[PDB]
Design an enzyme around this catalytic site. Sequence first.
Site, PDB file in Angstrom:
ATOM      1  N   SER A 211       0.915  -1.396  -0.094  1.00  0.00           N
ATOM      2  CA  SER A 211       0.010  -0.125   0.056  1.00  0.00           C
ATOM      3  C   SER A 211       0.850   1.281  -0.057  1.00  0.00           C
ATOM      4  O   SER A 211       1.809   1.445  -0.864  1.00  0.00           O
ATOM      5  CB  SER A 211      -1.006  -0.090   1.325  1.00  0.00           C
ATOM      6  OG  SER A 211      -2.172   0.719   1.050  1.00  0.00           O
TER       7      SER A 211
ATOM      8  N   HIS B 204      -7.792  -5.457   0.437  1.00  0.00           N
ATOM      9  CA  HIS B 204      -6.571  -4.981   0.492  1.00  0.00           C
ATOM     10  C   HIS B 204      -5.943  -5.603   1.855  1.00  0.00           C
ATOM     11  O   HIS B 204      -6.709  -5.302   2.815  1.00  0.00           O
ATOM     12  CB  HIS B 204      -6.950  -3.536   0.322  1.00  0.00           C
ATOM     13  CG  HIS B 204      -5.552  -2.610   0.175  1.00  0.00           C
ATOM     14  ND1 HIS B 204      -4.874  -2.335  -0.923  1.00  0.00           N
ATOM     15  CD2 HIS B 204      -5.159  -1.989   1.338  1.00  0.00           C
ATOM     16  CE1 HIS B 204      -4.035  -1.416  -0.672  1.00  0.00           C
ATOM     17  NE2 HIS B 204      -3.856  -1.242   0.747  1.00  0.00           N
TER      18      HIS B 204
ATOM     19  N   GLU C 248      -9.065  -5.079  -4.347  1.00  0.00           N
ATOM     20  CA  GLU C 248      -8.383  -4.141  -3.906  1.00  0.00           C
ATOM     21  C   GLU C 248      -9.506  -2.910  -3.211  1.00  0.00           C
ATOM     22  O   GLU C 248      -9.035  -2.325  -2.530  1.00  0.00           O
ATOM     23  CB  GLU C 248      -7.747  -3.206  -4.967  1.00  0.00           C
ATOM     24  CG  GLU C 248      -6.287  -4.143  -5.224  1.00  0.00           C
ATOM     25  CD  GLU C 248      -5.450  -4.169  -4.350  1.00  0.00           C
ATOM     26  OE1 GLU C 248      -5.313  -3.558  -3.359  1.00  0.00           O
ATOM     27  OE2 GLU C 248      -4.389  -5.157  -4.208  1.00  0.00           O
TER      28      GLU C 248
END
EC number: 3.1.1.7
Lengths: 534, 536
Positions: free
Chosen positions: A200, A438, A325
């Site tokens: 990330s 995610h 995601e």
Amino acid sequence: EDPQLLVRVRGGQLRGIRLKAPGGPVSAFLGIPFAEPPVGSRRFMPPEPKRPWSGVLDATTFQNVCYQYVDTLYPGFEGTEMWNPNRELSEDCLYLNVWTPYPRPASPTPVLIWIYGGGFYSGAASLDVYDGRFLAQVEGAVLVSMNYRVGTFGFLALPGSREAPGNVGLLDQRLALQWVQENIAAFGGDPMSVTLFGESAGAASVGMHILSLPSRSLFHRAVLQSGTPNGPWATVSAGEARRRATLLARLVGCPNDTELIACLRTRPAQDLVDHEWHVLPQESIFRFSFVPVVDGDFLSDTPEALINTGDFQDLQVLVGVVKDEGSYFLVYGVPGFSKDNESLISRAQFLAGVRIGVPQASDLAAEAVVLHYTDWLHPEDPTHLRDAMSAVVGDHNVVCPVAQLAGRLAAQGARVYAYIFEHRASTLTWPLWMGVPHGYEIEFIFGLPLDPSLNYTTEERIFAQRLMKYWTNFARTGDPNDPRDSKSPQWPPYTTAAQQYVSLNLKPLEVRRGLRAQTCAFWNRFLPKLLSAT
Amino acid sequence: EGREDPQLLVRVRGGQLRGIRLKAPGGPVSAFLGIPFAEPPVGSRRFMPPEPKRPWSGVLDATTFQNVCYQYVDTLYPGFEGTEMWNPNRELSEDCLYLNVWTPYPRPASPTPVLIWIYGGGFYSGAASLDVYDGRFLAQVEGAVLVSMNYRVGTFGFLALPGSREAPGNVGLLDQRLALQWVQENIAAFGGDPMSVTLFGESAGAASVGMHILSLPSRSLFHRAVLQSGTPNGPWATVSAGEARRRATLLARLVGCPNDTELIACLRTRPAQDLVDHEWHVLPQESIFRFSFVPVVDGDFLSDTPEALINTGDFQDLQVLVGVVKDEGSYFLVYGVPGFSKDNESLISRAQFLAGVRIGVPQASDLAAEAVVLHYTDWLHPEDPTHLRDAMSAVVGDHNVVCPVAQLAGRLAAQGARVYAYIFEHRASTLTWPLWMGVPHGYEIEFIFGLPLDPSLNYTTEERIFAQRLMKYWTNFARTGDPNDPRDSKSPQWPPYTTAAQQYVSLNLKPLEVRRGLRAQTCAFWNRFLPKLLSA
Ligand SMILES: *[C@@H]1O[C@H](COC2O[C@@H](C)[C@@H](O)[C@@H](O)[C@@H]2O)[C@@H](O)[C@H](O)[C@H]1NC(C)=O
Ligand SMILES: *[C@@H]1O[C@H](CO)[C@@H](O)[C@H](O)[C@H]1NC(C)=O
Ligand SMILES: *[C@@H]1O[C@H](CO)[C@@H](O)[C@H](O)[C@H]1NC(C)=O
């Protein structure tokens, strides 16, 4: 005293702690200072090297988490709490952690350096999911992780000023990288073989070290998980940084840059964080107030410009994305979405979510997104609309930025390997509709399934061992394929021609081609042409 | 009279006719060919609405096809059956307003549903006399009464100075309307039922059918409609009054004609061939699938744009059959896109693709054209010549036919109509066009009309059986407004097209397969996205 746990670094002597891993012991050296505490007059300032210390420094415990916003959306829920600070918050937070095999490696071992994510507003190297003991024990790796300043403390910039120049959080990371070059041989690590990996904002950070020349002599390979330096959220312009800094200052009653920053420096840390989210230009998700700035120093140009024109010949890169995601972010701002129900939404709510989810999009551009992501056979279907909403956010912010990066790096000489991660953890506490959200590949790469008390399936344990091998093979060689093993099948390099990538799930590697090719052409080629004309 | 076949003598409102007994594979049919339905639109009547034919004396010989309306004749591939099959097969003349009737032999004792065919050819070409439009098989096998009329094309049919008395525009459509009125008055003399008339047509013919649906005076003249590979909405079937005026006055200039009365009067002195020779010179851009003289939104025949009229119309007591062929665009690529030919595989470069898109979407801005390119590119193989060639075909077919048809079907269904939709996917074994063109525009027609039934034409046995199937569907639809067989229900059913379920059927050698969504995603691009781009 155990001589395996006693190490001399340039600053002085340290004492680590023997930790138990499932297969055997490891040596951990936790909470090692790599900078002078960035406190008082040093707030917003580049980090300074840690002064040497007397005697033996106790490195048996994780140090404080950098001062940050703490999420309160779902109190007492493990799916959110697993990312919250697990040590005391402090501005004094510039410490790093090292795990090595016990006894320490007889010969120089490849080093992996982890940079956590959290939108540049959160995170810590002390989180249970970033535990380096498994990689150390099972793969014989030297694993390093550092705390870096986040939020205003790390990224508030008044560009061109001496006192808040921007990107200091990135300089914290670079300092930890320098520390590894100078010191890691003492722990048995090879400073001539250092792989950065991050997820990330951490992957974006890894990307910025690729694009900033002074970082380049401090590592040899890179892994970017679900994040990129290019894309809509990872940088701001100097003008937009200035604007946000100036508004935050107004919001806290402050006060010439010198005067403004001096008053900001007088403010209790929580006073800054209280107003952190009030400076964003629109109602949005996947947007963060204080992030890396295109300063013309750390970042000589926009990452977009830098990836388009860079030479990446002697670089190897591993990049990838999780299957879903966008889902996780939907519950942090888009009406209709919640972990506590199936989040079935109306068309009206889809249209409204797109404006929040693509906040810089004009009316016409937002209509193009809705028209592209609508399934025109099932245009009103709430399950379709909900899943499309997730896709819009994930593609805009992660998948298409990733495809764009992979392609530029590959065209400009880099050796690139790409994956999509598609296994949903049996232990996941977020609801089924979020899929593989995610952040939920990390616990597998770090090897947490190998701890039998965590109740992963035996399949998940075997799978985690596969991933640990890909990552450490890549760190060792720049190729994630096992060089002493034959069949598999092999993970091919990602190229602009063939566009090959692999699926990471419980099944053997499957090779696929084209990482959302049509949809990312919409995001990467069409939309830019749209709003640069309109 | 005395010695002639008593079944071949019939009286209509204008006088007595003598037909001809023709052979169809299964037996004889009656044909009345070359029946005049208008006064010849010649001299001072050029560009003018048709006047009904004045009664004649004695017995008119209706045993042979009459003149074809004056038109541009395709000359691109001479000697080649693929193009010559569409070319005029009778003399070109401005005296061309005649119609044809096939009926069973002997004529049916009880009144039979009537099918009226309206040919296409971009409003610049066509004739009812072409072999592909032979009504004998439908008449003989299905017992149908089939009617086809010549209507004026090109400048003669569609040159307009809107608001003028002398060249009001849309007169080719008025010719068609007059032929529909002739059927109402006269078709019962042949055993046809004037209370069951189904229009069908292809391409510009289909567009014309749609325009008869949208023009209230036509509505009393028919009951059901079939539109094959064409629509009244879309980028080519109409022009604005301003664009018509602009083209008419450019044409006049090009032929030496400098107040509309004076301009039109000078145009009426010009030889027919002079007008045809400059017809293509008035198009605004380099283009394919665009035609110079077409229906005009005059605020009279067409009270508004077809787009407006389909979005707001009430179509409740209307049944409609609509469809497309698998490869609508391919045929058009060889009449103007560089890189394309019937005599090679037409593998093109990316540059040729981008150039082709500007020609294939001539009214598109730079931004719109790039949206098209980005949508139709396969981003795994952005430079594969075979994909580029096929994408070029798809662009042109989708823009001009497939997506206008989807739009049409959706509006019709949403506003009360019973709609049945198909995709026709069988490539004739006898097709002379190259394999890359797939199932091109125009090549369903020979099957609907039942040409494969003629064993001298060399279709396969399976194609014979397939033609018989299509002829049943079309005539069942003509009879009842439903292509499905009333009795036979073990066969798979053809469900109506709806906005909810978007169902249509594959027409090929296999039994009907039901599919959902007519190019749903791509047509959202053309029908919903592009027009919003057009707004700024
Ligand atoms: C295919 O033909 C196109 C049209 O030009 C011609 O057609 C071919 C069959 C020959 O008869 C030529 O003498 C004509 O000029 C070409 O423009 C196109 O490049 C051709 N494709 C290839 C690569 O052969
Ligand atoms: C799901 O729950 C949230 C809050 O509890 C609410 O705002 C939303 O409307 C709910 N949606 C559904 C599917 O009913
Ligand atoms: C049909 O086949 C016959 C028999 O071989 C052949 O001689 C004739 O020319 C063909 N006719 C057509 C229409 O091509």
